[PDB]
């Protein structure tokens, strides 16, 4: 894994004329880990004492542990020697299945009358919001997976603005093949999202589909649909909306959009 | 990585003048505020003068009217003109980024600095 580093060592060692903030912004993506380093004598509030964004309440929670909002994150805080100084190391490891979170860390030297602060901003969120369906050769099925990965609609603490909670999967319909929509393991999925896909697919009478099974796995619910043969071209968009689905204390879901392309061209 | 190189220090008599220079590389110089800093033995490093990308200046109260900070965007250099020097001005002088909000990537590891000694003997 690659590592993103914010090293403040021997850079918060002056008395400024006016209030000064030295800022390190991190946008960790490809499973990257994070190291924050600063002199031991600095006052540091980080990871187990961070400022975390709370999408549900649209505010920031101060002096809190990031594990309360992204439970699969794990970090260690050690004293190390670095650049010839006694320093503190904040080492956060981000596994592939860790959920989104937006938090900040503060680093304040003493005896500067509070005029100088270091700040780390860690914004962990998805950056691919559109994919094509993926063929599972072992199961002989095309899958749109909204239960994990890039198109996950599970409620999370990710910093998303109100108009940016859409994720999209495109399925080029193959006649007589089973198609799977994987969704989070939540009661709301069968209560409301399943009516949503049924009303979407049945709205146009000329669309041939068969709902085969509503299946509950170990960590997802799947809608299993077979589309029959067709002749004419058609594009059908369905929305499975959890962008307003709340989950205490801070989580909000996303909107899963599925685009069915019916085409005998190309 | 930002690289900083100060020069121009030396021994000067009280009341004399001195001009410090600092060459900065590794960043887009003309978009950054810059500043001069100094540290004497047993004192904490202090920001002495700052200059915005738009050439607005600010000074520590103890050097107001005696120091002048300037910049040459074409050469990526910051200057500190010091007149009416006092023994209390003796320190190692450093330049670096300044500003109210500074990207950590723009704040370079401190250069070697340049020594200024104001004394009669
Ligand atoms: C966050 O974690 C760090 C590291 O475990 C805590 O720092 C320790 O604090 C205790 C007493 O407060 C000291 O005896 C230890 O030596 C510290 N450890 C290190 C590595 O410096 C810190 O207190 C925690 N902060 C919060 C708010 O829980
Ligand atoms: C996010 O997806 C929603 C779908 O749930 C989009 O809202 C739909 O927009 C279409 C036009 O493109 C309308 O015909 C539908 O009536 C809308 N549905 C709802 C429930 O509002 C929304 O536009 C998308 N947002 C962005 C920024 O693309
Ligand atoms: C958290 O910190 C911010 C800014 O420092 C402050 O405005 C707020 O009152 C604090 N408390 C809460 C609960 O947000
Ligand atoms: C699709 O065709 C099958 C027969 O192949 C039929 O049983 C099913 O009812 C059809 N679905 C719709 C929505 O007409």
Residue numbers in the entry:
A (entry chain B): 27 to 292
B (entry chain C): 1 to 82, 82A, 82B, 82C, 83 to 100, 100A, 100B, 100C, ...
Article sentences:
We identified a heteromeric disulfide-linked complex consisting of P. falciparum Plasmodium thrombospondin-related apical merozoite protein (PfPTRAMP) and P. falciparum cysteine-rich small secreted protein (PfCSS) and have shown that it binds RCR to form a pentameric complex, PCRCR. The PCRCR complex functions to anchor the contact between merozoite and erythrocyte membranes brought together by strong parasite deformations. PfCSS is a cryptic 6-Cys protein comprising two ‘degenerate’ 6-Cys domains, and this protein family typically mediates extracellular protein–protein interactions, consistent with PfCSS binding to both PfPTRAMP and PfRipr. The eight conserved cysteines are paired to adopt the characteristic C1–C2 and C4–C5 6-Cys motifs in both D1 and D2 domains.
Consistent with the competition binning data, D2 and H2 nanobodies bind to non-overlapping sites in PfCSS. H2 competed with PfPTRAMP for binding to PfCSS. The non-inhibitory nanobody H2 interacts solely with the D1 domain of PfCSS (total BSA of 750 Å2). It binds near the solvent-exposed Cys30, which we predict forms a disulfide bond with PfPTRAMP, consistent with the inability of H2 to bind PTRAMP–CSS. H2 binds in a side on orientation, with most contacts mediated by CDR3 (BSA 447 Å2); however, the CDR2, FR2 and FR3 all contribute. The CDR1 does not interact with PfCSS. In the D2 nanobody–PfCSS crystal structure, these residues form the first β-strand of a β-sheet involved in the sandwich fold. However, in the H2–PfCSS crystal structure, this β-strand was replaced by the H2 CDR3, highlighting the flexibility of this β-strand in the absence of PfPTRAMP. Notably, all PfCSS residues contacted by D2 and H2 nanobodies are conserved among all sequences.
